[PDB]
Write an enzyme that holds these catalytic residues in place. Structure first.
Site, PDB file in Angstrom:
ATOM      1  CG  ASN D  52     -36.936   3.414 -49.201  1.00  0.00           C
ATOM      2  OD1 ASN D  52     -37.527   2.342 -49.312  1.00  0.00           O
ATOM      3  ND2 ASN D  52     -35.628   3.535 -49.396  1.00  0.00           N
ATOM      4  CG  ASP D 119     -38.111   9.246 -47.603  1.00  0.00           C
ATOM      5  OD1 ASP D 119     -37.066   9.900 -47.404  1.00  0.00           O
ATOM      6  OD2 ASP D 119     -38.127   8.157 -48.216  1.00  0.00           O
ATOM      7  CD1 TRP D 120     -37.548   7.759 -51.590  1.00  0.00           C
ATOM      8  CD2 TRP D 120     -37.715   9.385 -53.120  1.00  0.00           C
ATOM      9  NE1 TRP D 120     -36.293   7.983 -52.102  1.00  0.00           N
ATOM     10  CE2 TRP D 120     -36.369   8.976 -53.043  1.00  0.00           C
ATOM     11  CE3 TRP D 120     -38.062  10.398 -54.018  1.00  0.00           C
ATOM     12  CZ2 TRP D 120     -35.370   9.547 -53.829  1.00  0.00           C
ATOM     13  CZ3 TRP D 120     -37.070  10.963 -54.797  1.00  0.00           C
ATOM     14  CH2 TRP D 120     -35.741  10.537 -54.696  1.00  0.00           C
ATOM     15  CD  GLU D 143     -36.321  14.035 -41.721  1.00  0.00           C
ATOM     16  OE1 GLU D 143     -35.881  14.945 -40.988  1.00  0.00           O
ATOM     17  OE2 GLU D 143     -35.580  13.265 -42.370  1.00  0.00           O
ATOM     18  CG  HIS D 284     -36.131   9.565 -42.060  1.00  0.00           C
ATOM     19  ND1 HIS D 284     -36.237  10.697 -42.838  1.00  0.00           N
ATOM     20  CD2 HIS D 284     -36.600   8.544 -42.816  1.00  0.00           C
ATOM     21  CE1 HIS D 284     -36.738  10.374 -44.016  1.00  0.00           C
ATOM     22  NE2 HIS D 284     -36.967   9.073 -44.029  1.00  0.00           N
TER      23      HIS D 284
END
Ligand code: CEI
Lengths: 229, 310, 228, 307
Positions: D52, D119-120, D143, D284
């Site tokens: 994201n 992430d995603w 992450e 992150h």
């Protein structure tokens, strides 16, 4: 409106404390009254079990109600909103010595007076420290930082016992107050200025009378317009 | 300090006049000495010696436990209690010692005496035992002057305070404001004294002026090897070495817990041979906090001392 | 009073050497402040170890009690300690257990406050607002100030405001020691502090902080005849 | 929050236009996909998937360490970066998955591909891994989206904020106020980004409105067992059950220290066999704090899985 909260401007209170300092178990009782609109209170405390005390008395002065706090309009009153049900609190005390204390209290409201039930525990106090030496004259004024954490309110302060030698002995006091009911509005970061004094000592009565004044306010230093926080 | 009463003390409280009506007076040099005398059991003599700001009253609840085993005598030091005043108005350690020895000679004591000293009252005994090593059977001491003061480490925060006492201001502190009786006496007691019990201590020094000179001169004799009186320093050094060399002398130390001076002096007391150690609760005036336990300790210790005939 | 070699407005140069966990770094600061009114503004640079793997605000209290507005009723132990200056040792305990030690010296030469600071932090929680850098700034505080023989003890609770609106406190205890014998020692008072960050726009990599510190007694009148 | 620059980064700073000039485009379904391709060593394909609020720009300094070993392809997800928008305007997980696999189809990829998901971007790199289990050789995640969420025990204080995003309030947070770009991105990077590389991230969402819809739709796909999207929860459940059985699949877990999600997911990632664990600086977006470290780590990892 104090009438709906089951309160009035002047409120009485009866506190019962069960204490365990080191190996000494004791039981104390206090009766008093105070103004919840001006943050004043006066309670005379006596020992019901375990007399006399091998420690300095002033360590139980903070265990004998945030309802007696003068809150202005621009700061919401969490503790008066906590009523008619009342509120509990858990207090951790670390003296500048290594000795510690745990104070678990429950301020309820019954009929027309605050019914407080405190549990006091202390340990690791020093032999030459002013608590076991009883060098403490009284409590100096203090400033308790109060802020919000979800549903609870957290206060933190440094209480300074004045000594007979003119020196001072500090302890860090961190309290977490929780209202028994959801409570509407949570307060912003502010301070409560405390002054706890002992009134009648030229009157050998067996009582120990203490008067506490606690006024809530924000910082008196103006914040810079370009200032981040 | 606040403090609160003992709920079972007023039932057995002995007021000032009640305790004084049981004492006796006796001419000593150009004055007299008020003293409580058990008389009975004169085969042995247990002499209790109080310290500053107090009198024989201090032992009122401690003495009934030892009376059935030995004749207990407790005097008020000169210028203190209900005793007579000094001739020269001087109240150093040596004047108290002179009056105390002149009063000793007038009691028909046995050869070996048993001493129970508290505060300066120990030092007096500690002095006597050094000069009359033939006249000592056992020594009990509590919050004593076991040795000189070489550092303020484990001692309570009484520095500067004693400096204010020795530096002129002690006159306004003690003679004017009654420092040791009004402030230091009730502070160093865990419980709250009954009004009569405190009046019994206030009576000899209820007036301002030179009448409180003893309570002012007792701390000025402090054995500081740097800044203290060299004569008291030499006396303390001598009797401390003697007590350290006294293996044949059974002693009893009664440590005050938490105490006032015991934390700093229990080491020097441990460096005394033939010392049995017990501990009782209280501050400096441990007698007003654990009198019955102290009396039982002293009585069993005297009992085991007298049991020596194998 | 320039007998101590001072001026109402004073410039300052601070050199900090810090170590957080295993990250060593050096920071600099150039500032100006009013010592009579008790205000100070310092621009801070990172001269070594950039970037910092921790929240910056933990070094704000390490970047001079000479910038305190002492009234005539309270003794200024700090202004009296000059022209020699004064040192202090500071112990900080964060509410999760993290600890910090700040040893600082404050000298004067040409007429400037030359500060040398050593900062050492340890045992910070990886989920704490210092490692997570969730701190926006510092909230105002009250520091107890009292005399202890020749030293002066200050003690306070510093509250960082977080990005989520919550707060994270730490207990700070400072021992201030003068270099010269000070005339009058203070009784017991409180210094109200407000340390904020100005010029928040990106611009260059420097942090400008302004601190206002005012000494005063309690605003609650003591009941006559009461203790202490 | 106060951050300071990396003193040795503006000299090797790669601006947005400098990165997009090295990136290609290609029509995919009813839109197109902007992506970077190293081309060389096409026998092995490693694919870098951002999460994201980011783009291919996230892997600009990580990729120079792996290119001389395999062909590294980095796409901008649909509706993000310089790529096109989705047809229906929906930007859920499957809305990205469909376009991404259709774009995979137009790349001449080998049989077994290697994925680098963050992430995603890891969830996709996992969901595909569940559907085409025979088409993967290695997986590198950081992450990530490992398993579901049920407790919030050792998670960052993102609760209530998650509930704020899931409600109408989040529409003002992301669409009108650009939450994940103006706040989340610079906060979760230990260093202070230079203005050019921050503009490179702000460029796709510099305008108010529906264009920022992906950055709002990404967190609303969070796999919360209580309150989360049931379809995404089931998807992640399935491919986590598959990943716990991937005994022969060599995986690499990069833990950001202190990180943002690393502490809360490193224990759930230990339940994946054949996983080699490394740790290094960052929050992150650990690609902005320790890019060279990660590059060397995964270059060695891919060199040794090729063996
Ligand atoms: O000076 C002495 C004599 C002494 C006693 C024991 C020892 O080991 C060495 C010397 N004592 C002394 N020296 C100083 C103080 C004292 C002075 C000031 C003060 O605030 C508290 C105690 N007190 C006292 C004794 C005392 C008297 C009355 C009540 C309690 C204790």
């Amino acid at each position: 409106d104090l009438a709906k909260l089951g309160l009035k401007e002047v409120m009485p209170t009866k506190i019962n404390l069960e204490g365990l300092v080191g190996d000494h178990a004791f039981s104390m009782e206090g009766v008093g009254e105070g103004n919840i609109l001006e943050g004043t209170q006066e309670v005379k405390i006596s020992v019901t079990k375990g007399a006399p005390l091998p420690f300095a008395f002033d360590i139980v002065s903070v265990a004998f109600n945030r309802a007696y706090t003068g809150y202005p309009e621009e700061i919401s009153d969490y503790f008066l909103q906590s009523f008619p049900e009342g509120f509990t609190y858990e207090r951790n005390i670390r003296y500048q010595d290594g000795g510690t204390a745990i104070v678990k209290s429950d301020i309820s409201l019954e009929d027309g007076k605050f019914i407080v039930n405190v549990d006091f525990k202390a340990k690791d106090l020093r032999r030459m420290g002013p608590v076991m030496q009883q060098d403490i004259v009284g409590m100096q004024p203090s400033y308790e930082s109060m802020y919000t954490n979800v549903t609870s309110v957290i206060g933190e302060c440094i209480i300074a016992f004045k000594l007979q030698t003119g020196k001072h002995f500090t302890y860090h006091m961190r309290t977490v107050y929780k209202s028994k009911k959801p409570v509407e509005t949570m307060p912003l970061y502010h301070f409560i200025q405390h002054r706890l004094v002992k009134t009648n000592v030229d009157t050998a009565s067996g009582y120990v009378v203490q008067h506490e004044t606690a006024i809530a306010a924000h910082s008196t230093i103006k914040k810079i317009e370009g200032s981040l926080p | 300090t606040s403090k609160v009463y003992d709920p079972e003390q007023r039932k057995r409280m002995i007021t000032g006049p009640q305790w004084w009506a049981r004492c006796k007076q006796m001419n000593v040099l150009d004055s007299f000495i008020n003293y409580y005398d058990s008389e009975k059991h004169a085969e042995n003599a247990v002499i209790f010696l109080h310290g500053n700001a107090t009198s024989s009253y201090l032992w009122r609840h401690v003495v009934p436990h030892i009376e059935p085993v030995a004749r207990c005598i407790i005097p008020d030091l000169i210028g203190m209690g209900k005793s007579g005043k000094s001739g020269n108005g001087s109240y150093r350690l040596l004047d108290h010692y002179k009056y105390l020895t002149a009063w000793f000679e007038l009691l028909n004591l046995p050869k070996k005496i048993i001493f129970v000293g508290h505060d300066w009252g120990a030092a007096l005994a500690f002095h006597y035992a050094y000069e009359h090593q033939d006249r000592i059977k056992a020594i009990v001491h509590m919050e004593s002057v076991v040795d000189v003061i070489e550092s303020w480490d484990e001692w309570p925060d009484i520095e500067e305070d004693i400096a204010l006492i020795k530096s002129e201001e002690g006159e306004k502190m003690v003679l004017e404001n009654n420092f040791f009786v009004e402030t230091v006496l009730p502070s160093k007691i865990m419980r709250k004294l009954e009004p009569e019990e405190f009046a019994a201590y206030l009576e000899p020094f209820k007036e301002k002026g030179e009448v409180r000179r003893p309570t002012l001169s007792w701390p000025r004799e402090i054995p500081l090897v740097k800044g203290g009186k060299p004569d008291v320093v030499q006396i303390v050094r001598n009797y401390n070495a003697y007590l350290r060399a006294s293996d044949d002398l059974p002693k009893l130390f009664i440590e005050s817990d938490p105490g006032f001076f015991s934390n700093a002096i229990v080491e020097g007391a441990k460096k005394f041979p033939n010392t049995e150690f017990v501990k009782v609760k209280g501050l400096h005036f441990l007698q007003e906090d654990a009198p019955d336990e102290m009396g039982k300790y002293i009585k069993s210790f005297v009992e085991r001392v007298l049991k020596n005939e194998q």
